[PDB]
């Protein structure tokens, strides 16, 4: 029947598993699913070389996710957008002609404990039932200041395809964006001003 997902129990890649060890009890409460045999579900990680506000600063940007995504050709919130859960953009993405769309809505925004997550209800696509979580965390040693930013989905595996290929899909996607994410943090965080 419907399984839990088991992302909490095991090493993403990019991750020590020190770090790791540190971040079980947050990814077992953010980053677990219930998920039924139609659906996958994955967990990417990013290291990234700058203060966790520096990064929660551009992920927690829901009307703005082409500062940290590749492809965006527009998003749109319209008037007059406030961040509260619940709200909506219209993503353009522009990695095929016609350009794919997107309608998000923002379901979780949480700044003390640095998390959001959002949910595609609708547009062009094969992400049926998209949903993901983006948690942001600090870590320390010896003075030295790093992020770690974790983010898991669940989807539905669209008819025709396999679960290989939607979780390769969907894992690239999500990668190269956190790849973005880490360059242009990182580079917030050496110029600073
Ligand atoms: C890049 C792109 C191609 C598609 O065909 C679907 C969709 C338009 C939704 C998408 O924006 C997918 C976005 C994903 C998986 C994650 C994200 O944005 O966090």
Not at 125 to 148: A, C, K, M, P, Q
Request: aromatic share 8%; hydrophobic share 35%; charged share 25%.
């Amino acid at each position: 029947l419907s399984t839990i997902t088991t992302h909490h129990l095991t090493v993403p890649p990019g991750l020590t598993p020190e770090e790791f060890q540190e971040l079980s009890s947050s990814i077992a409460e953010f980053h677990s699913y219930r998920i039924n045999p139609g659906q996958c579900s994955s967990l990417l990680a990013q290291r990234i070389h700058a203060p966790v506000e520096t990064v929660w600063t551009v992920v927690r940007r829901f009307d703005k996710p082409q500062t940290y995504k590749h492809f965006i050709k527009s998003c749109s919130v319209g008037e007059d957008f406030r961040m509260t859960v619940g709200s909506t953009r219209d993503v353009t993405v522009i990695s095929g002609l016609p350009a794919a769309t997107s309608t998000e809505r923002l379901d979780i925004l949480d700044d003390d404990r640095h998390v959001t997550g959002f949910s595609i209800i609708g547009g062009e696509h094969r992400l049926r039932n998209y949903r993901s979580v983006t948690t942001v965390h600090g870590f320390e040693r010896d003075g030295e200041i790093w992020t770690v930013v974790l983010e898991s989905y669940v989807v539905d595996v669209p008819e025709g395809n396999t679960e290989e290929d939607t979780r390769l899909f969907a894992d690239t996607v999500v990668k190269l964006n956190l790849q973005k994410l880490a360059s242009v943090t990182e580079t917030l965080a050496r110029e600073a001003g």
